[PDB]
């Protein structure tokens, strides 16, 4: 269940908000495009006062669209329901051992007219061909998924469709806007028109392996694996004409297919020895990977029957399109590991790999990564020993490098696509390279061209990350107090990113580049206390606490200039934090005409507008004004896991949280302003009802205007709030039926349980609302509540 | 296991090393053309019509002032931020057009003229297309980067400057391309989408005339009016050139903005919007998707201004009411009116684009804003609702060609130059205004019936071929442009050229604000608003190589 | 000088469920087998196809529908059936003599 | 378990219990036109040009006499078998056309005239198309089954017979539809694919003209010429009717065979081939795929005969050479000639379909047969090679329309029915014949320069409006038809209407065997070969209901 959401205007308040905007700007509130007729006036004070509102039953002078007060969120929202079962059975003789598993998951989405289901089967096994010499084995997993997905941000589109629109029109049609109401389509209708768009997904993945042990402590083994998936679906365009939302009469079908095929192969030999106070592992091996995916599609318009039984490409009359391409890459890797220990006190481990990627030239295809780690089990030192309460104590220290080549498969290439323009867009932007050169107006095949999608980078290399760990593992009092403390320093080199190109470079100026280095470092702490009191209560606590500072080190000037890492192009980021932002700083709002003169010449500064401090200290605002206003790094993050058992009852919790965190978001632009958007008369948050006005001051929230003359939607601190929180991830209470009688029915474990997920969050007062760890969203995560059982045998 | 990583090749594309290949050259060339139909957005058409709501011709329209904020801010000259997306967009988009011309020229420069004999002729179209961008970029921004070394490697583009060239060198670099296209284009193009030698002359002209009105100080104010520049405009509007192409005026004014008459003698050069051409929904003119009227469901932008409407009034003798046109709203029963009104502005009680079954009204059906932006429809880009040339994609659009240079604009540029040269042939330059004015007097095919049906009084008369003061032939010339080119996005850009930007807008702001409350707090800042700011994000990425405009 | 590419695709999905009870008897000389049960089958299959013309590079690596420039066709439909079956069986003899 | 078997339903299909619905009605209609563009075959085109090689106008062409065997057997009238696959093919194809008209008509009848007032006008179009197929069947088979009860269930079709009606009763059933179309079609069709009133009238007349040349006997010979029939041919060829439609002769003869002039004022009714239209490659006129000349690679069928080339010769007064034309082959430098020849035959040394960049010659590029079948090229269905309207499918095709009724047919049919009426109206028919002849005399747009470049003497003159004998005016009418409709495949059907089939074709067989050695053992059989055999497969499947034709048992 969705348990909260951004509240939006009532159809009652939608008019209050407009009247207030109109009269704040000094034009007649009664000349609105949606009218909404008001009898207002003035108090003996000069100010305007709203006395009452009237809307005339239908939204037009024709009576096709009745007035409603729609809860567009409650309208496209269900209680979601999930059911799942899983049965699994294993058989272990010695000779070999097999396994088998069936299960099913089904999910009525929390969005209406949406669903999802999955069937799994797993079948694993091995065989001992020669009693301690040749094992052979296989793993296999088979999945089938079917879903109707919710459309691209509909909840977002439900929150800004005014409640004055109805769900159904006056015949019984799908309701929708009329006149000057915003060009937003009915979302409940969107969902219906979508309900038959269902994909079907099959995935096979597993491996076979041989393990051969030629003598004592040396064995070699190759495995081979594939992972094939396949998605097919048909999407239906049906014709709609709800209010001013027309399609005019478009029917189409698209039947699309996708195909992903990954295979992999390794071979690994290991030798290990054991000579009294001497232990060693050495391992050597290689592994190939290869993915080839690929997709295509068939499109046909115009169908004499509007049902998914008829809408197949064969039955289409109108025009048609065909789409599809494919891509792939291959990785190759060679590696070794060293393991050595003296007695059981001082341990050493070295690793070395050379990895190569399809994604690069060959000047930089391969790249070698080394690692060395070593510990010291101190409690095995005989001088220690006497303590005896101190159960264990190691002192670890690691240093290693690791690569990243997770970038586009065609990174290095200047890509030219023939894009003829066969494909949907919005408000233009075909970018289509096909033109009626002859001036014939068409009726035929136009001459086509090529077009650049990307510039190459034939000197692009791996992103190497250098990392250095040191920690202390401890266990105390008969292993009742266990934990760790470590510290990391991660330093990344030649960071891989896709870089939007400068403006005058024009079409497809983006390329994949390496742009410098970044620093990340901090501490971790783990502490568990597991005991059991006199009155028979097992308890096991295990919390965690962390902290880290991030620092951008070097950057190409162009890259630091264009604010991608990135100080908004007004200040470089080198020396600060990945994701730090420079902006204007809002010091409340002007509460009378005096504060406006008693403050720097600010372009659109009026009474009730937002007052931005001057940091020039030159008595004007301009654009140099700003400084750093946002920092993503938290003061520290923490987590604590609680297990309890008492009298067959079985209770577990998990708390996570973060404290001291800046958070920047756009949701206020829809909740504090009537005009901080690019489209007129969309529905707005519930809070701008308490904006500043003559009749209502000392409000933080600026007044209500029909246009953003003060540039309120500039990068400011208005949009940075406090994202401190403490989330209760999961709680789960269980009853386990006593084995003495769960065995009476040929069982062993028989337990029922109840559980919740995201039950509650604990948030700062300074936060506008919804989810602190998802500030960008107008709605929270959905709350799960589960009943279930386990059975044992 | 080094073969292994090299086996997979890119799929469904051409790699950069092979684009330079000869057989793809004409591909590049056509692709450079296409982007003029496919590179634009409803919020940034290559007609610049959005940045003409600055002038006295038109309003923004829409649901209201909030519907499309950043453009209401341009309509009143207030609120325009150097960070606004609609300005960063139009900058980038136009420069994207230049990529394609530059890529094509990179191939063309290498072709061997033995086998590819049209080598120079194609180079021209591309250089002709490259100018079409820089030209619009100049009018919008003035301080523009000059992109013309098509052999620039991409990383050298971070070192470019929009002050490498003095303002007049920039106009010059724009002209140099059209200069090349004149010297190398053929006299006739069988494929109407290609420019002819006539058009490159007429664009070489329009360039030298924007250059003539010098702004050689640090600000956007006139610093004289160059004669050597004006003298070139005369050279390349020579009617002996136009005749080699068959280019002239059409029998009737309405034949330019109509599909049945695409590509006649006045379509000197046009973007060739086509349909039923195998693209997703047609290569329609999607950019004007907001300018369609509210009867199609949306959206009612690009509403003609009353001050444009009233400037189609005429006196009894048949001439403009130069000094009294705006004092009284046009009243159909009594005033005399220029026919050209009924091809520019669809007004209530009259038919919408010649279909007498759709009568424009004052209701939710025709004004999306219940009046706040008026009840006038643009007509020149819209088409017959019942046309077999009009589809609905995201918004509505049609196959109606966009004419970048009409021939009426080849004559009036020639009359303006002769009037500002003042050298005895000012009497010649009135007989050019007569050619345009006389044509409009008879453009009453399709609207002859309006006299008896709606009570209209057409009177438009050519001026007497006598002696006129210079500053008076500059009054008659500014007016012919006003009633010839309404809603055709030329208006404001003229004013700035004339250097009376500040005066005419503010005075139009005042007289118009009693009629349209959005204009009530407007105000143009002299030597700041004649151009758009260079977009913040473009300055910022140069790492200090780009210069701002004066006043920002 | 025609160039084209068809991207075909077929799917065939059958599923089958049954239930079978079997009792069998053996009283010295006599021997029995009675079985009873039912079985449902369903097949749904389908296929679709994207055709495109004119390709500036005549190699399978270039010739995907996306890279095409001439005109396009789209093809496809589906079919399916189901069977239900009920059934019983008798078996009997005196000790491998008469059956 | 019953819900389980009802759950799957057909995919991408209307079931034949929703087809009668009103929203599909115009769908059935357009469907019924298309099969005229789509239901034919290179070896069975709905122009019937394959079965016009039997006349004196053309040859088969091809590699040789082995290429298209069953058609060389029709050319020489020796070897036709009641079981040849092509005769069966056309019988079934034309009856397929009648399927879509009768299915359209079934659904049209149940429409409410108040909810759908185009109801009668579409029944009209559908009945007009039904008669179009029936007419061509009669021309080809004579003893045909009349399938015009569109409310017949399908098993009622096993009891149908081709002798249910007498020959004159058959033709009246064909007439009876055309007769309906006239009374209910509108006078102008803004959608040029549908026939106007004038078209149905034209077609009503043509049918009564074949109906008037009676074969009331057991055999194929004439048994009289009915005046009541001929009085209907005059009636519906009235220029008052025609003028209501805006129909008439074109300025130049070549306009009727050029893509640039589709649906002009002579295209009284036509089949609307089209390109760039969503179909896989068509809707082209695929049926003429064999007739494209060797220069395109294939296949060189439908060649004009010398007996046709020479029939365009003229005397010094510009009249035809009725008694002496075929003696000496046409010599370009000496003899006068009808301009109509250079829009009908494309000859060696001359521009192929007006494109001077392709001069026909006598070589492997122009004759697939190394001269066996001659070096002439039919031009009325090919086009300029450089045409944007010509695509390569299986075979080569254009979107050049197919004119079923040209208007010159309206005039020459009217003249014939005046001359045979001999009610003293023969001078009005000579005025008709002149309209057609005067037009052609002047039809020299696109070949004007042929006088000084190739040496061509144009001379065509109208006849002087004096008194003429019936038997003479019937000669002047046949010759105008001969030159005016060359290679357009009404030829052989004219000779069978006139009952001259045996005498003319045998005479041609003799005169032409010295020029095309495939004609050397040819022999037409009187009272057998004027028509084709009812196909054996079709007789045999009727289980006794179909009678064969005379002379085939
Ligand atoms: Mg304005
Ligand atoms: Mg066009
Ligand atoms: Mg013959
Ligand atoms: Mg045609």
Tell me how far CA of residue B102 lies from CA of A267, B21, B95, B203, in angstroms. 52, 15, 10, 19
Beta bridge partners of B458: B337
Q: Which residues of D are part of a known binding site for Mg(2+)?
A: 53, 55, 262, 273, 399, 401, 519
Are D38 and D281 in contact, with CB atoms under 8 Å apart? Answer: no
Peptide linkage before A566 cis (omega within 30 of 0): yes
Are A582 and A560 in contact, with CB atoms under 8 Å apart? Answer: no
Residue A429 has a CB neighbour count (10 Å cut-off) of: 17
Contacts of C67 in chain B (CB under 8 A): 12-13
SS (H, E, C) A2-42: CCCCCCECCHHHHHHHHHHHHHHCCCCHHHCCCCCEEEEEE
Taking the alpha carbons at both ends of chain A, their separation in whole angstroms is: 35
* Rounded Cα–Cα distance for residues B357 and B360 (Å): 10
* Rounded Cα–Cα distance for residues A370 and A20 (Å): 67
Beta strand residue intervals within B442-516, DSSP E: none
User: Which of D392, D132, D133, D405 is closest to D284 using CA atoms?
Assistant: D392
For ligand 2, the distance from its centroid to the CA atom of residue B193, given in whole angstroms, is 9
Q: Experimental technique used?
A: X-ray
Mutate which of B47, B49, B60, B67 to test chain A, going by most A C-beta atoms within 10 A? B67
> Given the DSSP bridges, would you call strands D457-458 and D336-337 parallel, antiparallel or unpaired?
parallel
* Rounded Cα–Cα distance for residues D443 and D448 (Å): 9
Q: Which of B13, B97, B368 sits opposite A179 (nearest CB)?
A: B368
What is the biggest distance separating any 2 CA atoms in chain A, rounded to whole angstroms? Answer: 103
Contacts of A310 in chain D (CB under 8 A): 11-14
* Dihedrals phi, psi of B289, to nearest 5 degrees: -65, -25
Name the residue of chain C whose CA is nearest to B9's CA.
Answer: C61
* Rounded Cα–Cα distance for residues B411 and B421 (Å): 15
* Rounded Cα–Cα distance for residues C10 and C23 (Å): 43
CA atoms within 13 A on the CB side of D443: 27
Q: Of the ligands numbered here, which is closest to the C-alpha atom of B272?
A: 2
Residues of chain A numbered 271-310 and touching chain B (CB < 8 Å):
288, 290, 292, 294
Inter-chain CB proximity A421 and B82 less than 8 Å: no
Is A473 among the annotated ligand-binding positions?
no
Coil/strand/helix, residue D433: helix
> Given the DSSP bridges, would you call strands A218-237 and A366-376 parallel, antiparallel or unpaired?
unpaired
User: Which of A530, A519, A529, A521 is closest to A495 using CA atoms?
Assistant: A519
Residue A419 C-alpha from the chain's centroid: 30
List subunits contacting chain B, requiring 3 or more Cβ pairs under 8 Å: A, C
Name the residue of chain D whose CA is nearest to C47's CA.
Answer: D11
> Given the DSSP bridges, would you call strands A610-612 and A586-589 parallel, antiparallel or unpaired?
antiparallel
Range of the domain at B129: 1-552
The single-letter DSSP state of residue A66 is: B
Are A465 and A494 in contact, with CB atoms under 8 Å apart? Answer: no
Is A424 among the annotated ligand-binding positions?
no
Beta bridge partners of A763: A725
User: Which of B135, B141, B215 is closest to B533 using CA atoms?
Assistant: B141
How many folded domains does chain B comprise?
1
Planar angle of CA A123, A126, A131, nearest 5 degrees:
165
Taking the alpha carbons at both ends of chain D, their separation in whole angstroms is: 60
| Number of helices followed by number of strands (H, E) in chain B | 18, 11
Mutate which of A287, A449, A568, A713 to test chain B, going by most B C-beta atoms within 10 A? A449
The secondary element (H helix, E strand) that includes residue D505 is helix D501-512
Q: Return the exposure string of A363-393: e unless at least 16 CB atoms fall within 10 Å of the residue's CB, then b.
A: ebbbbebebebbbebbbeeeeeeeeeebbeb
What is the biggest distance separating any 2 CA atoms in chain B, rounded to whole angstroms? Answer: 91
SS (H, E, C) D84-153: CHHHHHHHHHHHHHHHHHHHHHHHHHCCCCCCCCCHHHHHHHHHHHHHHHHHHHHHHHCCCCCCCCCCCC
User: Which of A636, A773, A625 is closest to A711 using CA atoms?
Assistant: A625
User: Which of A627, A518, A630 is closest to A579 using CA atoms?
Assistant: A630
* Rounded Cα–Cα distance for residues A72 and A52 (Å): 25
Is B401 among the annotated ligand-binding positions?
yes
CATH at B205: 1.25.40.390
> Given the DSSP bridges, would you call strands A134-148 and B355-359 parallel, antiparallel or unpaired?
unpaired
Planar angle of CA B365, B369, B370, nearest 5 degrees:
65
Name the residue of chain C whose CA is nearest to D279's CA.
Answer: C73
Are A724 and A72 in contact, with CB atoms under 8 Å apart? Answer: no
User: Which of D148, D51, D52, D47 is closest to D95 using CA atoms?
Assistant: D148
List subunits contacting chain A, requiring 3 or more Cβ pairs under 8 Å: B, C, D
* Rounded Cα–Cα distance for residues D525 and D502 (Å): 7
Burial of D242 (0-12, 13-18, 19+ CB in 10 A): buried
Beta bridge partners of A85: A104
> Given the DSSP bridges, would you call strands A636-646 and A627-630 parallel, antiparallel or unpaired?
unpaired
User: Which of B58, B57, B54 is closest to B75 using CA atoms?
Assistant: B54
Query: What is the least distance, in Å, from the CA of C3 to any CA of chain B?
Result: 14
Name the residue of chain C whose CA is nearest to A325's CA.
Answer: C64
Query: What is the least distance, in Å, from the CA of B249 to any CA of chain A?
Result: 19
Q: Where are the alpha helices (DSSP H) in A223-366?
A: none
């Amino acid at each position: 269940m969705y348990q909260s959401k951004m509240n939006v205007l009532n159809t009652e308040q939608y008019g209050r908000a407009m009247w207030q905007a109109y009269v704040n700007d000094g034009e007649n509130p009664n000349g609105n495009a949606l009218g909404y007729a008001y009898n207002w006036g003035y108090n003996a004070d000069g100010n305007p006062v709203l006395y009452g509102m009237t809307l005339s039953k239908y939204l037009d002078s024709k009576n096709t669209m009745p007035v409603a007060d729609t809860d567009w969120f409650d309208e496209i929202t269900r209680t979601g329901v999930i059911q799942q079962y899983n049965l699994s059975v294993s058989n272990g003789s010695e000779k070999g051992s097999s396994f088998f598993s069936l299960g099913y998951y089904k999910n009525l989405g929390v969005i209406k007219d949406t669903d999802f289901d999955r069937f799994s089967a797993r079948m694993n096994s091995d065989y001992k061909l020669i009693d301690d010499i040749l094992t052979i084995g296989q793993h296999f997993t088979l999945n089938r998924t079917s879903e109707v997905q919710a459309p691209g941000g509909i909840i977002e589109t439900a929150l800004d469709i005014p409640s004055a629109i109805p769900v159904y029109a006056s015949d019984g049609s799908w309701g929708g806007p009329v006149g000057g109401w915003p060009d937003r389509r009915n979302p409940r209708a969107v969902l219906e028109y979508n309900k038959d768009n269902r994909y079907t997904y099959w995935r096979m993945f597993g491996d076979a392996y041989v393990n051969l042990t030629p003598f004592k402590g040396f064995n070699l083994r190759s495995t081979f694996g594939l992972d094939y998936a396949n998605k097919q679906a048909r999407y239906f365009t049906y014709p709609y004409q709800e209010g001013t939302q027309t399609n005019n009469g478009k029917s189409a079908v698209e039947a699309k297919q996708e195909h992903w095929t990954k295979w992999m192969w390794n071979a690994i030999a290991t030798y290990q020895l054991e000579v009294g106070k001497h232990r060693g592992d050495v391992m050597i091996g290689m592994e190939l990977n290869r993915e080839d995916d690929s997709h295509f599609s068939g499109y046909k318009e115009d169908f004499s029957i509007l049902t998914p039984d008829y809408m197949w490409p064969d039955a289409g009359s109108g025009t048609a399109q065909a789409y599809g391409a494919g891509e792939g890459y291959s990785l190759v890797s060679f590696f070794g590991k060293m393991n050595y220990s003296y007695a059981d006190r001082y341990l050493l481990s070295l690793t070395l790999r050379r990895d190569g990627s399809s994604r690069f030239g060959k000047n930089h295809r391969y790249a070698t990564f080394p690692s060395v780690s070593l510990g010291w089990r101190i409690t095995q030192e005989n001088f220690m020993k006497e303590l005896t309460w101190l159960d264990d104590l190691k002192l670890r220290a690691s240093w290693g490098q690791t690569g990243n080549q997770e970038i586009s498969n065609l990174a290095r290439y200047t890509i030219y696509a023939p894009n003829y323009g066969t494909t949907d867009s919005f408000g233009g932007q075909s970018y289509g390279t096909a033109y009626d050169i002859t001036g014939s107006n068409g009726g035929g095949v136009l001459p086509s061209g090529f077009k650049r999608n990307q510039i190459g980078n034939d000197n692009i290399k791996w992103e190497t990350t250098t990392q250095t760990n040191v920690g202390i593992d401890f266990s105390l009092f008969k292993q009742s107090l266990y934990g760790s403390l470590e510290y990391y320093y991660k330093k990344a080199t030649d960071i891989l990113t896709e870089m939007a190109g400068v403006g005058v470079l024009g079409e497809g100026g983006s390329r994949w580049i390496n742009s410098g280095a970044m620093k990340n470092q901090g501490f971790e702490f783990n502490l568990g206390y597991r005991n059991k009191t006199a009155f028979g209560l097992t308890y096991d606590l295990n919390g965690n606490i962390s902290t880290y500072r991030n620092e951008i080190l070097e950057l190409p000037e162009t890259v630091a200039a264009n604010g991608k890492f990135g100080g908004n192009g007004v200040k470089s980021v080198v020396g600060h934090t990945y994701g730090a932002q420079v902006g204007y700083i809002a010091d409340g709002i002007f509460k009378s005409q005096d504060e406006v003169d008693n403050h720097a010449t600010q372009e659109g500064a009026a009474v009730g507008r937002i007052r931005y401090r001057d940091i020039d200290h030159n008595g004007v605002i301009d654009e140099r004004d700003q400084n750093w206003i946002y920092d993503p790094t938290p003061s520290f993050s923490y987590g604590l896991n609680i297990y309890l058992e008492y009298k067959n009852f079985d209770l577990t919790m998990f708390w996570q949280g973060v404290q001291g965190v800046d958070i920047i978001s756009d949701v206020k632009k829809k909740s504090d302003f009537w005009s901080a958007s690019n489209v007129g008369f969309l529905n707005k948050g519930t809070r701008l009802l308490n904006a500043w006005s003559p009749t209502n001051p000392n409000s933080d929230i600026p007044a209500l205007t029909r246009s953003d003359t003060n540039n309120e939607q500039r990068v400011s601190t208005y949009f940075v709030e406090n994202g401190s929180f403490l989330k209760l991830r999961n709680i789960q209470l269980g009853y386990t039926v006593p084995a003495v009688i769960s065995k009476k029915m040929r069982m062993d474990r028989l337990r029922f349980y109840c559980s919740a997920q995201n039950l509650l969050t604990i948030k700062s007062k300074n936060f506008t609302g919804e989810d602190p760890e998802n500030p960008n969203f107008s709605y929270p995560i959905p709350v799960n509540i589960t009943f279930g059982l386990n059975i044992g045998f | 296991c080094d073969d292994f990583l090299d086996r997979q090749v890119p799929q469904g594309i051409v790699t950069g090393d092979q684009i330079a290949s000869p057989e793809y050259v004409d591909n590049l060339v056509i692709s450079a053309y296409a982007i003029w139909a496919t590179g634009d957005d409803i919020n940034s058409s290559f007609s610049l019509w959005n940045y003409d709501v600055r002038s006295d011709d038109c309003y923004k329209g829409g649901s209201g002032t909030e519907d499309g904020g950043v453009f209401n801010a341009l309509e009143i000259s207030k609120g325009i931020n150097t960070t606004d997306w609609n300005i960063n967009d139009i900058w980038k988009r136009l420069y994207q057009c230049i990529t394609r011309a530059n890529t094509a020229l990179q191939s063309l420069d290498q072709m061997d003229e033995k086998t590819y004999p049209l080598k120079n002729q194609r180079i021209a179209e591309m250089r002709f297309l490259r100018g079409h961008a820089h030209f619009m970029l100049k009018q919008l921004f003035k301080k523009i980067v000059i992109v013309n070394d098509e052999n620039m490697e991409p990383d050298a583009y971070n070192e470019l400057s929009n002050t490498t060239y003095t303002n007049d060198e920039q106009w010059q670099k724009i002209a140099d391309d059209f200069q090349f296209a004149y010297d190398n284009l053929p006299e006739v193009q069988i494929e109407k989408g290609r420019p002819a030698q006539a058009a490159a002359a007429a664009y070489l002209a329009k360039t030298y005339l924007y250059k003539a009105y010098r702004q050689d100080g640090a600000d956007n104010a006139l610093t004289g009016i160059n004669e050597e520049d004006l003298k070139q405009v005369v050279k390349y509007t020579d009617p002996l050139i136009m005749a080699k192409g068959g280019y002239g005026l059409e029998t009737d004014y309405s034949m330019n903005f109509l599909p049945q008459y695409e590509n006649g003698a006045e379509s000197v050069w046009a973007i060739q919007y086509s349909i039923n051409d195998g693209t997703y929904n047609g290569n329609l003119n999607w950019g004007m998707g907001l300018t369609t009227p509210q009867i199609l469901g949306c959206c009612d932008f690009h509403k003609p201004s009353q001050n444009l409407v009233n400037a189609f009034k005429t006196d009894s003798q048949g001439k403009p009411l130069f000094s009294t046109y705006d004092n009284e709203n046009y009243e159909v029963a009594t005033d005399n009116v220029d026919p050209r009104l009924f091809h520019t502005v669809g007004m209530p009680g009259f038919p919408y684009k010649y279909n007498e079954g759709y009568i424009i009204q004052k209701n939710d059906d025709w004004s999306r804003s219940k009046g706040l932006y008026g009840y006038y429809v643009s007509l020149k880009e819209n088409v017959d609702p019942d046309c077999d040339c009009l589809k609905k994609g995201s918004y509505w659009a049609s196959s109606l060609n966009h004419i970048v240079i009409r021939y009426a604009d080849v004559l009036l540029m020639r009359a303006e130059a002769l009037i500002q040269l003042n050298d005895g042939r000012i009497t010649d330059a009135i007989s050019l205004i007569n050619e345009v004015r006389s044509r409009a007097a008879g453009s009453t095919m399709l609207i002859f019936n309006y006299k008896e049906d709606y009570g209209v009084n057409f009177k438009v008369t050519p001026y007497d071929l006598k002696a006129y003061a210079q500053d008076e032939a500059m009054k008659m010339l500014k007016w012919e442009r006003r009633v010839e080119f309404g809603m055709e996005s030329s208006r404001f850009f003229d004013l700035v050229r004339w250097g009376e930007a500040k005066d005419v807008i503010n005075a139009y702001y005042v007289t118009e604000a009693s009629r349209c409350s959005i204009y009530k707090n407007a105000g143009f800042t002299e030597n700041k608003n004649e151009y758009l700011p260079v977009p913040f994000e473009q300055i910022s990425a140069s790492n200090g190589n780009y210069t701002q405009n004066f006043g920002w």
